[PDB]
Amino acid sequence: HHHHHHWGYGKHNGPEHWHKDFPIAKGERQSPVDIDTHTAKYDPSLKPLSVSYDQATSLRILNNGHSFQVTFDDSQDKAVLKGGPLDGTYRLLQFHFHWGSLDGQGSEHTVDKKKYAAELHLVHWNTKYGDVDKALQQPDGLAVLGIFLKVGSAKPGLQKVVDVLDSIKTEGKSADFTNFDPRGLLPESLDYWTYPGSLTTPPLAEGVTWIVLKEPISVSSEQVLKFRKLNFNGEGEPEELMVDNWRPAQPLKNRQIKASFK
Numbered sequence: 001h002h003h004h005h006h007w008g009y010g011k012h013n014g015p016e017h018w019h020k021d022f023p024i025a026k027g028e029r030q031s032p033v034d035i036d037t038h039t040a041k042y043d044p045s046l047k048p049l050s051v052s053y054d055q056a057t058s059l060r061i062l063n064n065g066h067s068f069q070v071t072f073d074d075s076q077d078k079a080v081l082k083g084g085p086l087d088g089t090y091r092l093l094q095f096h097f098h099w100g101s102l103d104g105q106g107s108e109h110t111v112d113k114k115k116y117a118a119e120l121h122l123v124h125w126n127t128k129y130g131d132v133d134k135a136l137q138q139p140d141g142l143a144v145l146g147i148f149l150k151v152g153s154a155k156p157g158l159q160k161v162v163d164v165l166d167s168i169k170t171e172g173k174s175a176d177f178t179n180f181d182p183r184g185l186l187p188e189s190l191d192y193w194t195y196p197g198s199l200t201t202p203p204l205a206e207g208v209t210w211i212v213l214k215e216p217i218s219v220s221s222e223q224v225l226k227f228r229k230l231n232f233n234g235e236g237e238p239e240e241l242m243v244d245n246w247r248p249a250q251p252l253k254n255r256q257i258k259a260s261f262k
């Protein structure tokens with residue numbers, strides 16, 4: 001009998017191939033999905049999302065070769081998420097983005113089939129499991145907040161991020177990044193869609209409660225061009241621009257997307 005045991009976004013190792021190392025891709029709970037709003041059953045019993053970033057302590061920003069991420073002190077309930085569909089408190093650990101080679105693509109989730117120019121993921125782990133390592137092993141371990149990005153009007157709360165991207169151009173670079181306020185990345189409304197799903201990068205584990213916000217945030221084509229100057233490659237290796245680091249929509253199968261808003 002068969003016996004089973006690096007990935008990227010290129011043609012040879014991109015999403016179409018991930019299922020071969022990570023057969024959970026063949027599952028029923030993969031992300032991202034297309035959000036079909038005809039079929040998204042509004043639900044009144046979904047509560048306001050309580051985004052409590054009162055005391056958020058950013059630490060580092062870094063280029064991991066797939067994306068950039070900003071990490072937070074997650075030792076205390078300094079930045080948490082509760083309400084919406086979540087049973088309990090989920091503490092923020094990091095945020096990262098996915099984006100395109102051009103403005104017409106970059107988002108992971110789609111809405112009635114439209115792709116936005118980038119998507120922001122805020123990654124939270126369920127405090128009752130004690131840390132992110134134990135949480136990552138559970139069906140209700142993680143909660144990701146997804147925020148769409150469209151081009152036009154510059155986003156101010158993002159300039160602090162964008163001003164340092166040239167210090168972390170290549171894979172493995174990092175910097176101290178303190179006193180960054182994540183609330184300056186939220187849009188005004190917090191109406192959301194929710195469904196059970198997965199990480200969108202390997203290992204593609206199916207323990208994620210997805211919360212996608214209806215309202216995108218806007219950013220200047222100058223800001224998102226800064227995203228596009230990052231490299232997938234390391235210093236001294238041939239240049240390969242960090243673009244199109246998004247997984248395409250996966251089939252919803254027997255799941256239903258719920259809405260918080262009519």
Ligand SMILES: NS(=O)(=O)c1ccc(NCc2ccc(B(O)O)cc2)cc1
Pocket residue numbers: 069071093094121123132144198199200201202203
């Ligand atoms: N793209 S996503 O679905 O938001 C996604 C979220 C999380 C993960 N991996 C899990 C994970 C946990 C901790 C850190 B860290 O730097 O402290 C990074 C990644 C993989 C994909």
Ligand code: NI
Pocket residue numbers: 001003
């Ligand atoms: Ni065996």
Ligand SMILES: [Zn+2]
Pocket residue numbers: 096097098121200
């Ligand atoms: Zn992500």
